[PDB]
Amino acid sequence: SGLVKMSHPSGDVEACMVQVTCGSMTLNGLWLDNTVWCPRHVMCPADQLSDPNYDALLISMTNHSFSVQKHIGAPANLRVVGHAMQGTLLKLTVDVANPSTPAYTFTTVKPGAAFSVLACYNGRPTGTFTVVMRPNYTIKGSFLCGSCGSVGYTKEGSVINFCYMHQMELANGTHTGSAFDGTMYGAFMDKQVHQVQLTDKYCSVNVVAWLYAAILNGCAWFVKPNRTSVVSFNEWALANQFTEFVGTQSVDMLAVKTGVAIEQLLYAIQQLYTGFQGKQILGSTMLEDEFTPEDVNMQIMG
Amino acid sequence: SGLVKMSHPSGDVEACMVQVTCGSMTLNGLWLDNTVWCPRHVMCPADQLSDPNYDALLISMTNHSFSVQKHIGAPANLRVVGHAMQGTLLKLTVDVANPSTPAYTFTTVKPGAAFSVLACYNGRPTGTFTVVMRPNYTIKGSFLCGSCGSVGYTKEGSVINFCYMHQMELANGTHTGSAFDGTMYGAFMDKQVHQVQLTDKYCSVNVVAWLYAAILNGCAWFVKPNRTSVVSFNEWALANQFTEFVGTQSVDMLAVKTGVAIEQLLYAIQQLYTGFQGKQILGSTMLEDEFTPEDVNMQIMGVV
Ligand SMILES: CCC(=O)Nc1ccc(N(Cc2ccsc2)C(=O)Cn2nnc3ccccc32)cc1
Numbered sequence: 001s002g003l004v005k006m007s008h009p010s011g012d013v014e015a016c017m018v019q020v021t022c023g024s025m026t027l028n029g030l031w032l033d034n035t036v037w038c039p040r041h042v043m044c045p046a047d048q049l050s051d052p053n054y055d056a057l058l059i060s061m062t063n064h065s066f067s068v069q070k071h072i073g074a075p076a077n078l079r080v081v082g083h084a085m086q087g088t089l090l091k092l093t094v095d096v097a098n099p100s101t102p103a104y105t106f107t108t109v110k111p112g113a114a115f116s117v118l119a120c121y122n123g124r125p126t127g128t129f130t131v132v133m134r135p136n137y138t139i140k141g142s143f144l145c146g147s148c149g150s151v152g153y154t155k156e157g158s159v160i161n162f163c164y165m166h167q168m169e170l171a172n173g174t175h176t177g178s179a180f181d182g183t184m185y186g187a188f189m190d191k192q193v194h195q196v197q198l199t200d201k202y203c204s205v206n207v208v209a210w211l212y213a214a215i216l217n218g219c220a221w222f223v224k225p226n227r228t229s230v231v232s233f234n235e236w237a238l239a240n241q242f243t244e245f246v247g248t249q250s251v252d253m254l255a256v257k258t259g260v261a262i263e264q265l266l267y268a269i270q271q272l273y274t275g276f277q278g279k280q281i282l283g284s285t286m287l288e289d290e291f292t293p294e295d296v297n298m299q300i301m302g
Numbered sequence: 303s304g305l306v307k308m309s310h311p312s313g314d315v316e317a318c319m320v321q322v323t324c325g326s327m328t329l330n331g332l333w334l335d336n337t338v339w340c341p342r343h344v345m346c347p348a349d350q351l352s353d354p355n356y357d358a359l360l361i362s363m364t365n366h367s368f369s370v371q372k373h374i375g376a377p378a379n380l381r382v383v384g385h386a387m388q389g390t391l392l393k394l395t396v397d398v399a400n401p402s403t404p405a406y407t408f409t410t411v412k413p414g415a416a417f418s419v420l421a422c423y424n425g426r427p428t429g430t431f432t433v434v435m436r437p438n439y440t441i442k443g444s445f446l447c448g449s450c451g452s453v454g455y456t457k458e459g460s461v462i463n464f465c466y467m468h469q470m471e472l473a474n475g476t477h478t479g480s481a482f483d484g485t486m487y488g489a490f491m492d493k494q495v496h497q498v499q500l501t502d503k504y505c506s507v508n509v510v511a512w513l514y515a516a517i518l519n520g521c522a523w524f525v526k527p528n529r530t531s532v533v534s535f536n537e538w539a540l541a542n543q544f545t546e547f548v549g550t551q552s553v554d555m556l557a558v559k560t561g562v563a564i565e566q567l568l569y570a571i572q573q574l575y576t577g578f579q580g581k582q583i584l585g586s587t588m589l590e591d592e593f594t595p596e597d598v599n600m601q602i603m604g605v606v
């Protein structure tokens with residue numbers, strides 16, 4: 001028993017991190033087969049960060065402008081033999097296929113979804129943590145300058161789903177990046193300018209997941225017979241900083257195992273939003289929305 | 303910027319996990335060169351869990367009573383060619399040295415200290431998280447049956463400090479295990495019998511660390527000129543379920559970077575623990591004590 005923030009084992013991804021340097025700029029990249037992905041602002045000189053002409057910058061580059069070093073677990077000398085730009089990413093081609101490339105996919109995650117981040121500096125992995133893609137297409141991470149190119153991922157069986165490459169800090173403790181299709185989450189621009197963020201919201205389906213966890217750990221005081229329909233909850237949510245609740249098969253399994261219906265928890269949420277009346281739930285005096293239904297099924301029930 | 307719960311990259315340790323089997327019983331083990339470590343309760347029949355005679359169980363076994371297998375990386379079986387017990391652990395000698403053995407040492411963690419855990423089932427890594435050794439020598443983890451033998455560690459340079467091997471659940475969300483000298487944290491017994499816990503406490507020096515993190519992240523409303531000396535804080539702590547505060551150079555560095563004195567934060571804690579009066583600190587409405595001084599220096603200052 002117990003529920004805590006958990007990340008995927010990082011070994012597979014660690015073996016894929018490298019350093020990328022272009023002029024006076026260096027950061028992290030991801031080495032999959034013959035490709036090395038990194039943020040394109042690695043091209044950008046310090047005096048143009050607030051207004052990069054990425055088209056011009058790409059034109060000025062040759063394969064010799066890029067230095068790619070493997071700093072852990074290999075005597076790998078990596079020659080760049082091709083370079084291209086795909087959205088906010090660079091795609092560099094190298095003359096050697098990463099012998100430790102995992103089975104993998106590229107997937108764009110939606111709000112409320114969780115993934116593991118492998119924080120990296122100069123191609124050296126330093127730490128791992130889990131984040132949720134906030135409803136405003138930010139994440140709440142722990143990143144310092146030099147962490148760009150750190151990757152985010154999930155894992156289904158042996159397959160690694162790469163879904164995030166770290167790009168920028170937007171405000172204290174507020175970060176964003178792109179999917180590997182090159183699209184930036186939240187459409188934030190990779191320029192050094194201040195950019196307004198939309199309002200954050202409680203991830204309703206994750207709060208339900210978390211309450212199911214509570215019930216399965218013997219904490220069920222908030223459960224009453226009373227129910228609120230999905231439809232009525234979703235109207236209330238719009239007025240009260242909650243996302244729309246969409247049920248999944250993962251949520252339904254928690255309902256089955258506990259015998260407590262989703263609609264009882266939607267009711268509970270409307271009562272708990274008002275406050276906990278001096279009580280707690282799994283050690284918290286506030287609603288938690290960074291535990292997903294899948295995460296709870298994994299941790300409570302295997 | 304940002305402060306999150308952070309664990310060590312786990313790849314080094316992943317390559318050392320195996321499954322240990324003793325008849326109908328199975329759990330996880332740690333393969334370092336020639337030796338496989340695992341909990342000795344792998345030997346105990348359901349029959350006997352409440353009152354196990356481990357000495358008697360050991361002599362009833364031969365090398366053939368055990369087997370080991372490697373699931374991650376290149377799969378293999380590892381033949382057992384010797385067996386021994388050290389405290390609450392077995393040391394099984396196997397016929398192949400782990401070719402991916404890291405540099406490591408065996409340490410014992412003290413209360414308030416943090417380490418990473420690699421949760422494993424059937425010798426397969428499933429997740430990682432970070433815990434603090436509570437003042438009552440438990441940790442607050444996430445473990446299912448089958449997770450026994452999962453390890454906890456920290457890392458200095460290349461050297462992995464193995465400090466924990468998971469043994470048992472004591473109560474809901476409450477766990478303990480042993481150090482690799484075989485001694486159980488808190489001197490809990492590896493027996494299925496109820497055992498009372500000592501009182502858990504707020505880890506004061508960690509709470510101080512987290513308030514510094516807050517200040518460094520633009521959250522400093524609780525900072526006032528008011529102070530409380532350490533000694534006077536510590537007399538207060540005895541009475542209000544806080545640990546004795548002991549300063550360290552790690553803490554001192556944070557004081558300097560922020561220009562806010564430990565004593566000011568000790569005063570703040572005395573006000574905050576009754577509640578934040580509707581305000582928030584790093585998104586929390588309660589004191590957080592699982593962020594260590596060293597962890598905050600690393601995450602925010604970049605210093606290790
Ligand atoms: C040539 C040397 C150099 O320093 N380049 C550079 C690159 C990126 C950034 N930006 C802003 C931005 C975005 C697109 S273009 C510029 C970050 O947000 C970097 N960043 N990412 N996570 C951070 C966390 C803390 C501080 C800075 C952080 C700043 C500087």
Ligand SMILES: CCC(=O)Nc1ccc(N(Cc2ccsc2)C(=O)Cn2nnc3ccccc32)cc1
Binds near residue numbers: 327351354445446472
């Ligand atoms: C197949 C036979 C079998 O079940 N053996 C067995 C071994 C250990 C335990 N105990 C208690 C204990 C200790 C020494 S002797 C008994 C745990 O706390 C196991 N444990 N560890 N983390 C857990 C998390 C949830 C449930 C049980 C957990 C329970 C059962």
